[PDB]
Structures are given as structure tokens and as C-alpha cells.
Symmetry: C2
């Protein structure tokens, strides 16, 4: 009956709460530290800048002067920046979740340890999901492609950059923030399944 | 040499080619019949139209709200945006259903044309076309649902109504323009490109089993 040890549940529930605050950008910070969303937007803004650069690049190219090759190239030149953006956001968020773990579970080494390993596992799953969605987007962007005409083309790329500017970051927030936070909270709850581990936690 | 039935190698080569032409919009038609790409574009244009209407509608709704609250001062919006987005799922999925029908009929007409004489062959090919159709429609539908989930979730102290109004306007602008291409992209990728490719791969896989050539 010493298993009032289910009262670790309160710990988890508190931790989970903090996680959800991070997911909704309603976290609580010092005067000497930045928000999560702001680090993330810094990353996304770098992306938009890159996009703008490459779009200016092909605009200048065609202003100087099959068609598809140029599109293929344009996108291939975006694969590295996009995935690099994914990686930087993952790191920011994983660091965030870990600081929540350190704070709530610092005293219980075993629990803190297993929680952090859970955090990593779920991170790699959702990173896989995000990368697959992004690659799918570029694939779609290429395949689905098919007298002063040039303007239309510029306009095309323009719309395209502006689409990608939000579409890739959405995919990244969805999987690395929302779906990640959700899976994490669920896994945190599912930890309690096997009961012979409570004393050890 | 009675097995000159390796002329299947040609049939498929040609059939497959024709299919790919449909995918690349370079099909060949009479003067009194229209291309596939255009039949599809009409559907997409209808979608963009629906988008434009619904988006002007919530723009007006939230402008009225912001005015109301500004006037009083001298979740409500999340609900409205959520509603706005759920209202697009049905038109989006209906557009998918309408395009599946168009493309399926197109692919069947190519099979009838190339395989009309060989009833067994035509039959198994049409069944194949159906199989690949339902699988790829499943994929497309999942992607569309995923896009809208994503749009809902990613949509989500001191504020001002002036700023909320600005932000929301910018949002509706960008979102409508995105969804305008994004839903048709999914439909083309899955119902045209991946569908056509899957079909050609299957036809290639037919040349493998030779003890069945006779039956064709």
C-alpha cells in the first residue's frame, strides 16, 4: 500500500503543463532570457531571407535573358537551408523541453534520466515526420510544375517563395512543436504502466 | 516463335507512353473534346473561387468584431478562424472526388483503346486501375486532412485590437493564396503523377509472368 507512489503523477502533470505552455508560446521567462517562439522565428526569418536571396537570384538570371531545369535547381538549392532550419528548431525545442525536465526532476536522477531519453526518442520520430513532409513538399513543388511573358514567371516564383516561406515553417511547428509536445505528454503518462519501477524512479 | 506475344512489350510501351502524356498534359484529342489538364483546371478554378468567397466572408466577420470591441472599449476570433477553415474541408475533398472521377474515366478510356480486343487483359488492367485509384485517393485525402489539421494548430499580457486586425488580415491573405495552390498540388501529385507512375509500374510488372501471356 506504500504505492501512494502514484503521487508522482502530480509531478508529471505539472511537467506536462509546463510543456504545453511552451507549445502554446505562453511560457514564462526572466528578463535575462528569450522566449521560445522568438528563437524559432529568428530561425524562420533566416529561411525567408534565404528564399528571398535565391528568388532574386533567378529573377536576375531570367532578367538577363527545358524551363523545368531552372525550377529543379531553384528547389535543390533550398533543400539544405530547409533541413538546416529543421535541425536548428529541433535543437532549440529539445533544449527547451530538457530545461523543463531538469527543473522538475533534477532531484530524482532516475526519473530525470528516463524522461530525457523519452524526450530524445519522440524528437527523432517527429524529426522523421517533418523531414518526410518537407521532402514531399519539394517533390510536389517540382512535379506539379507543368511577348513580356517573363513577368508571369517572376510572379510564379514570387508566389512560390511566399508559399514556401510559410509552408515549411508550418510543417516544422506542427511536428516539432505541437505533435511532439502531445506525444511527449502521452508518453509521460504511459510511463506509469509497469508498476515495479515506481520506487526506482 | 508462336510466342511473338512479346509484342506485349510494345503494347505496354505505347499504353504507358499514352498514360504519361495524360500526366504531362500532352495527350492527343479530337477537335471536339478537351484535354485532361483543362478539365482539371476548371475544377481547381472553382476551388479558388470558393476560397475567395469564404475568405472575404470571414474578413468581413472579423472586421465587424474588431470594430465592435474597439467601440466597447471607448477566444472569440480563434473560434471564427477555426470555423472558417473547417468550412473549406468539404469543398476541398469534394474537389478531390470530382478530380478522381475525371482521371479515372481518362485512364479507362486509354485502356479500352489499347486493350479492347483482349477481354481478359482489359479486365485485369481496369481492375488494376481501380485498385491504384482507391489507394491513391486514400493518400490524397489523408494529405488534405493533414494540411487542414496543420492549418488549425499552427494558427494558434498586452495586445491591441488595431494589431489583431492587421495580423488577421495578413493571415487571411497569405492563407487563402497558399491553400489555392496547396490543395490542388496534393490532388495532382497523388491522383495524377503518383497514380500514373504506379499504374505504369504495374503494367511493367505484367510482362514478368509469362505463363499468363496466353490467357491474355
Amino acid at each position: 500500500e506504500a504505492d501512494k507512489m502514484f503521487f508522482l503523477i502530480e509531478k508529471i502533470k505539472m511537467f506536462n503543463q509546463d510543456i504545453e505552455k511552451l507549445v502554446e508560446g505562453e511560457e514564462v521567462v526572466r528578463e535575462n532570457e528569450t522566449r521560445l517562439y522568438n528563437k524559432i522565428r529568428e530561425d524562420f526569418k533566416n529561411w525567408v531571407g534565404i528564399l528571398a536571396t535565391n528568388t532574386q537570384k533567378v529573377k536576375n538570371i531570367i532578367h538577363e535573358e527545358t524551363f523545368e531545369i531552372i525550377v529543379h535547381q531553384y528547389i535543390q538549392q533550398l533543400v539544405e537551408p530547409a533541413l538546416s532550419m529543421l535541425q536548428k528548431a529541433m535543437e532549440i525545442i529539445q533544449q527547451a523541453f530538457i530545461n523543463v525536465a531538469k527543473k522538475h526532476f533534477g532531484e530524482f536522477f532516475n526519473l530525470n534520466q528516463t524522461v530525457q531519453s523519452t524526450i530524445e526518442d519522440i524528437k527523432v520520430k517527429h524529426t522523421a515526420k517533418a523531414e518526410n513532409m518537407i521532402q514531399l513538399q519539394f517533390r510536389m513543388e517540382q512535379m506539379v510544375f507543368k511577348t513580356e511573358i517573363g513577368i508571369h514567371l517572376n510572379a510564379y516564383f514570387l508566389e512560390t517563395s511566399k508559399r514556401l516561406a510559410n509552408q515549411i515553417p508550418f510543417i516544422i511547428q506542427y511536428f516539432m512543436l505541437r505533435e511532439n509536445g502531445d506525444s511527449l505528454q502521452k508518453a509521460m503518462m504511459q510511463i506509469l504502466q509497469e508498476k515495479n519501477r515506481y520506487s526506482w524512479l
